[PDB]
Amino acid sequence: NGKVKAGQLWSKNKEELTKILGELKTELSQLRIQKISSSGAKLNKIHDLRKSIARVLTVINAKQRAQLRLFYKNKKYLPLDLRPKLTRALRRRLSKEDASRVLEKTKKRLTHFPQRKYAVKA
Amino acid sequence: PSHKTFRIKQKLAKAQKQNRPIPQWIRLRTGNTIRYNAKRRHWRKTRLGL
Amino acid sequence: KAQIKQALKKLYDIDTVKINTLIRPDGTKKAFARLTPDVDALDIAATKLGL
Amino acid sequence: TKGTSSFGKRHNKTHGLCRRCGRRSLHNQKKVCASCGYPAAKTRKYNWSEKAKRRKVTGTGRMRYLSTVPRRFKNGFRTGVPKGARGP
RNA sequence: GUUGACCUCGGAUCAGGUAGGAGGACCCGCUGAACUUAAGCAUAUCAAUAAGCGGAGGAAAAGAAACCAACAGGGAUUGC
RNA sequence: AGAGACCGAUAGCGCACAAGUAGAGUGAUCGAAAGAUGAAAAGCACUUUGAAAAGAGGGUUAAAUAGCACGUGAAAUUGUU
RNA sequence: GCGUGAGCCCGGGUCGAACGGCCUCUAGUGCAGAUCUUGGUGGUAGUAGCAAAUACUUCAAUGAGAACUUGAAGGACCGAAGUGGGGAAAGGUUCCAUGUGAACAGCGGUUGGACAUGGGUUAGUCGAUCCUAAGCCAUAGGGAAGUUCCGUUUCAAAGGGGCACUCGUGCCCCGUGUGGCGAAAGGGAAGCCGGUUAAUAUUCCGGCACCUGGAUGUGGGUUUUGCGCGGCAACGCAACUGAA
RNA sequence: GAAUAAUUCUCACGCCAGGUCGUACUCAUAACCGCAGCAGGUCCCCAAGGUGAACAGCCUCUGGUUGAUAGAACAAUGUAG
RNA sequence: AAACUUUCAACAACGGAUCUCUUGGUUCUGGCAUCGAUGAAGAACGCAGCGAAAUGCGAUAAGUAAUGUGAAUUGCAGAAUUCCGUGAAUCAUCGAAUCUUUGAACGCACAUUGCGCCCGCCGGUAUUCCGGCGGGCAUGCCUGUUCGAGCGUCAU
Ligand SMILES: [Zn+2]
């Protein structure tokens, strides 16, 4: 056969995915055995096989990864790898909600004496 | 010596792999300039530091 | 050796009685596996494309 | 016997491979590296020679992680996928 | 006697967190020379600099007078 | 990212090239040399002498007074007339 | 050909892509020297020389080519504190087979520890892994502006052993404590013979053994005087309860 | 902890398993260090016959070499005997 | 008279100056602020149909997914597509993943691929032994939780 197309792999579930994953390894192992002592057009298949397995692996992982992200939402604590990663320094600034709080005396003055919109004639 | 360590064994394996002449097509590629290997080693010429 | 023995059984459904190993000067491991006397080798090698 | 005769008595090694810099500068008896200062927490570095400083500074290696931050900053450290993507 | 509080000092692979390293052109501190000039040389000069050590940011530091003045008085800090 | 009354392969950064590489020291460290065929490889089929390296004919090209020791090819120094 | 001169202009040959005259502006602006810097080349010169460790010779074969290739036959040396047979440190593919232009083997070279293409190192019993020695470094603490210096049982609340559930949870005893690294020549559980490959073997093949750890059965032994008998004795035998 | 069996017998026989790394070759008038295929230097194990007091010197067996640029002539001055 | 030494010319040699070129340096000006225990900089070992180095990547290993473009790559071989849609490329962009052994480096150590402990699953009669697989075990400090020590101390 040939390379497995990435288009159909998305509309599956884990059971066929693992069967396809399991079978693909089998031919790759055996087909390699032919490589010793004989060179032919079958060598091209070796590259195609390896590359196909990669696609199926990412699909299984991506499908699994999305599922538990939904599960851990609406929760206070979640795993370290699913938390957003920006920057060590960027994760420790004060939040905008707290970096914008003010005191009552400061608020009292600004409610009654804010900046105005004036103009001066010449 | 016949007594070695895995690290010394491992270093010797790599230093043996990178000592052979250049393959043949490389000098037949378009716009190529490599002529002869510039990092050849020989056990009776120059010891690298392990 | 434990991993090699188990792996052979799951791949080729063959059983061994003794396994020896060494590390070649290039950095790969070579393993000698001897088979139970009730099974012959040649046919299995031919069946599994050995030789 | 000050010279040539006494060079044939050398068959011992004072230095070995270092685990942190791969350089053969680990003193065997002291067990401290004469170039990276291992096992000290911080790496040896001195200002009375800047040639030795340039030989090991950022950008002389693979840069497996730092060399991808410029792109991420320009794009604003976002997340998610384009609306028309597939694979959920 | 029993029971229930308080104060100080501890254990725990208890729940949740945080610092080390890199870089150091520019910045904030500590420590700290000699060559050289004086036609010699010791105070002096090179210099409150080079080397060493600690600590941060895109700028850092300073800052709303226990100020300057002696005028008909000016009015946080920074830079030319 | 944009520029110069800057340098033009012994110059300009130590590095225009598989350069902090090859190499030296037990070590801290020290640290180079090396750019240019032709528009296009069209990188010399075939015959002949030779054990072979190669030579002589014969070819490609505007030019082989451009033949992978390749643009132009001075002086010191050498051979023949 | 011109100019007293630094210099300028033309004729002939080679070569292949840019370059001059005049007035102003500008500078990393003119070489024989510095035991100057880098690169290249001469006379000396086919000269000095290739002289320690006793030494070679005949026939045949391969080959374009043989003193230093191979086989046979002579003549010699090392003379068991060896020019023999194996190892520790160090070396790192130098080991074996097949082939080979140039370069290297201070003469030659069909030969090579050189060049090209492939192959080769099997362990419960040999070592490392375990224990400490001289010595090095964490912990409790105290110095120092600081990188860090001392400190190794010290002015420390420092551990480890047993059992049962329905089951993880629960129970019961002993305590001054007392951490790691450091030997291929120190201490230390256990394998011998015969054969085999171009290249490994106390490992591979055949035979005959041994040590440690873990679960279990048969034979035998002991007991109704509940945990054996004999010898005067030194002691004997196939066994013959033993926690803190 | 037994009287129809019980047994915590260090006796005999019988069951299962034993993980990881090194193992080629030289150890030196050519495989180590001295710029090199350098008369230098570098730790050990086994040790035949004869003369002789003897691991002295001299000759031989097992085993190993026949490798150090060659041909011709025999002046001076040399080095060694 | 030849030979030898010397001078000049033509041609042929050794060597790489001069002329022209340049994906390279140097200086000035302008815009921006982004490393790390969610494991940085650096180091080691690996990965290609035929690769040693450089460049790129990490057992999903000369790369995977997703978006954009729209017919290649090229030293050889081999295939892939072909235009319906089911899409070449060492292409450009990049919002999802993988990421061996190490390194501040974190079970104890390391001149050793050395030696430990806890929990769960799978085999061998097995809670205690052996093998395989997965998840864990550093130090300083803060807030809270729980269990404790003291005639320091309060009331029966
Ligand atoms: Zn180091």
Q: Which residues of D touch A11 (CB under 8 A)?
A: none
- The whole-angstrom separation of Cα C39 and Cα D80 is 59
Question: CA at B35, C1' at G43: how many angstroms apart?
Answer: 40
List Cα–Cα distances, A37 to A53, B23, B33, D63, in angstroms.
26, 21, 35, 41
Strand partners, C34: C18
Distance between CA A54 and CA B3 in Å, rounded? 42
Q: Judge if the beta carbon of D53 is closer than 7 A to nucleic acid strand E.
A: yes
Instruction: Please name the residue that has the structure tokens 């288009």.
Output: A7
- From chain D residues 20-79, the ones with a CB under 8 A of any chain A CB are 77, 79
- Give the distance, in angstroms, between residue D47 CA and nucleotide F24 C1': 25
**HEC letters along chain A:** CCCCCHHHHCCCCHHHHHHHHHHHHHHHHHHHHHHCCCCCCHHHHHHHHHHHHHHHHHHHHHHHHHHHHHHHCCCCCCCCCCCCCCCCCCCCCCCCCCCCCCCHHHHHHHHHCCCCCCCCCC
Crossing angle of helices A42-72/A14-35, nearest 10°? 150
The span from the CA of C31 to the CA of C9, in Å, is 15
Give this entry's resolution in angstroms.
Answer: 3.0
Strand E positions closer than 7 A to protein CB = 16-24, 50-54, 57-58
Residues of B in contact with C23 (CB under 8 A): 9
Residue with tokens 């016997």: D1
The residues in C 1-51 lying below 8 A from B, measured between CB atoms, are 23, 25-27
The coordinates were experimentally obtained by cryo-EM
Cβ–Cβ < 8 Å for A17, A10 = no
**A34 and C49: CB-CB below 8 Å?**
yes
* Distance from CA(C35) to C1'(G73), angstroms, rounded: 56
Q: Which residues contact C22 (CB under 8 A, 6 or more apart)?
A: C29, C30
Tell me the CA–centroid distance for residue A11 and ligand 1, in Å: 53
- Give the chain B residue nearest D16 (alpha carbons): B50
Distance in Å from H69's C1' to B17's CA comes to 40
Q: Measured over all CA atoms, what is the biggest interatomic distance in chain A, rounded to whole angstroms?
A: 99
Residue C14 and residue C8 in contact, taking contact as beta carbons nearer than 8 Å = yes
Q: Which nucleotides of H are covered by protein (CB under 7 A)?
A: 18-26, 32-34, 37, 40-42
User: What kind and span of H or E run contains C41?
Assistant: none
For residue D73, what is the enclosing H or E element?
A: helix D69-75
Q: Cα separation of A17 and B46, whole Å?
A: 55
Strand F: which of residues 38-77 in chain D lie with Cβ below 7 A? Answer: 46, 49, 51-52, 54-55, 60
D28 within 8 A of D35, measured Cβ to Cβ = no
The token pair that represents C17 in the structure block: 């009685």
Q: Is D29 assigned a ligand-binding role in the annotation?
A: no
Q: Contact, B40 vs B19, CB < 8 A?
A: yes
Residues A79, A72: Cα–Cα separation, whole Å: 8
Nearest nucleotide, CA D42 to C1': E21
Task: Nearest chain C residue to B13 by CA: give it.
Answer: C26
